[PDB]
Design a protein around this ligand. Structure first.
Ligand SMILES: CSc1nc(-c2cccc(NC(=O)c3c(F)cccc3F)c2)c(-c2ccnc(NC(C)=O)c2)[nH]1
Ligand SMILES: CSc1nc(-c2cccc(NC(=O)c3c(F)cccc3F)c2)c(-c2ccnc(NC(C)=O)c2)[nH]1
Lengths: 281, 282
């Protein structure tokens, strides 16, 4: 009821928007049968499991209801699998911070951390494990609104530099390892999209973590934010913070952003403009 | 606070969509400052009429409406007055009914209900549309319609839509909006027929005085036609109030096949949820 199965004849891929490990992303047009309208959408043709299993996980993916979690809207099952969701012209968060390296404000970064924590806490409440949280898997509806996508794709279909030690060593994935990946994502945002452990071979990461080394303190970060990152990267999974707690912490910091980030928001009207044209959510 | 004043630099007209009385409509792009994104928008360049503040003050009123069945003006640019609003791919209801001449009684009755709701809202905010008509009703989804362009007439002639008092003394009230509502219902029930086809507008006042009105639509039972006829009474105070129209049509919509007769006379929860997730999160 929440997942619309689509025929091939009712939609069309128009241009390629990007790619990821799980597949290719297109701008498409949905033509509602019996109408003459073209409605833009985002289509992910997954790369190369029984059909009943694919469909069951697509239902799970389509049952989420949270302002910061993307919901799968439609699926097309043929020789390939095509996922359909709302088209968001702003793209993914990693690309955006890289494009706005010299103008992003501290309010946005703290608010993005808050929103990602809300999405993650929601998924934990639904007993869902993302397995690949990262700045590239967070989409921008509006500069003030971000949404996590693609949870569960990893299990159905390896980002070593984002994974917890337990995941690299014993292929264990939990909400706590998602917290580790959250720490890495916050690090990505605070560095304006820097590559974690740039130039370091992935095969050394297990070693570097075992001797106690972690990603460096980001230049714009006071010790307050970096401590949260470090707690997300504790070897003992049960000692890392809970998403529910990170929301509060980052929200407090958002109440006074200039004190917690040191770098060299929309007016009420612009926000309603943005919301009326693209975010009635 | 509710009206964004725009600068010619933030947007662009890209395609012409149509013309009407108050102006020409284009599909356009808002390029938010600082960004590289082009966001689809709807622009209406208005025809000349009032100083710019007067315009803006009426634009502020037009921008303060908050009702699911009333279009809200979002932005304005003031060489030409350009109004901006969200782009709605389905266009106006009149063209929709003409293109699907394939429509069941439930859709028709629900459109009447939603239009009356929007009108009753405008009456509550003490605004008089002055040009209610199928052409001024836009379709967000086939299940969701919205009145637009209220107030645009005063700020800047649909004779076949106006009450006798409006034709004779340029008197406009909520009760004359009730008249135009009746004519709008007639357009919908006839699948977009042109009211008083063939009768010169100059003679409309005469035929109305002699007691002649629009004919009963073939698909209409006497109940619906009686509602229309009551909307076209000479005594303004005897016509129905929008809040009463919302009830009767609502009731009729609860048993649609008893009040409209369509040969071969409904969206699934799945498809409804889809439309809403792509185009109507309201
Ligand atoms: C990683 S990169 C990326 N993937 C997508 C995409 C597209 C279609 C479907 C899903 N994913 C799902 O449906 C989905 C899933 F697979 C599991 C759980 C929940 C879900 F919702 C992702 C986008 C994207 C999306 C919208 N708009 C834009 N706009 C621009 C300009 O890029 C880009 N980007
Ligand atoms: C003559 S018909 C018509 N006019 C408009 C239009 C465009 C921009 C602004 C306003 N109106 C206002 O700003 C406004 C006002 F002037 C007074 C009170 C409240 C208001 F909101 C109307 C459309 C339209 C709109 C969106 N999408 C589509 N899509 C397609 C395919 O046409 C068509 N159609």
């Amino acid at each position: 009821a929440l997942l619309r199965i689509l025929k091939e004849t009712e939609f069309k891929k128009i241009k390629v928007l990007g790619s990821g490990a799980f597949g290719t992303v297109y701008k498409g047009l949905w033509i509602p049968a019996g109408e003459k309208v073209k409605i833009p959408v985002a289509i992910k043709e997954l790369r190369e499991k029984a059909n009943k299993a694919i469909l069951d996980e697509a239902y799970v993916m389509a049952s989420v209801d949270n302002p910061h979690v993307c919901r799968l809207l439609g699926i097309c099952l043929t020789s390939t699998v095509q996922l359909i969701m709302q088209l968001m012209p702003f793209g993914c968060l990693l690309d955006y911070v890289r494009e706005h390296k010299d103008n992003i404000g501290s309010q946005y970064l703290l608010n993005w951390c808050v929103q990602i924590a809300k999405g993650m806490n929601y998924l934990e409440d639904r007993r869902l494990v993302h397995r690949d949280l990262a700045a590239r898997n967070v989409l921008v509806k509006t500069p003030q609104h971000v949404k996590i996508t693609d949870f569960g794709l990893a299990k159905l279909l390896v980002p070593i530099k984002w994974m917890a030690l337990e995941s690299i060593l014993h292929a264990i994935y939990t909400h706590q390892s998602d917290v580790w990946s959250y720490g890495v994502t916050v690090w990505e945002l605070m560095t304006f999209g820097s590559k974690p452990y740039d130039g370091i071979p992935a095969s050394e990461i297990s070693s570097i973590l075992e001797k106690g080394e972690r990603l460096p303190q980001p230049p714009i970060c006071t010790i307050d934010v970096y401590m949260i990152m470090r707690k997300c990267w504790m070897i003992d999974a049960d000692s890392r913070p809970k998403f529910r707690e990170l929301i509060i912490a980052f929200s407090a910091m958002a109440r006074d952003p200039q004190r917690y980030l040191v770098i060299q928001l929309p007016s009420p009207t612009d926000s309603n403009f943005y919301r009326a044209l693209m975010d009635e959510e």
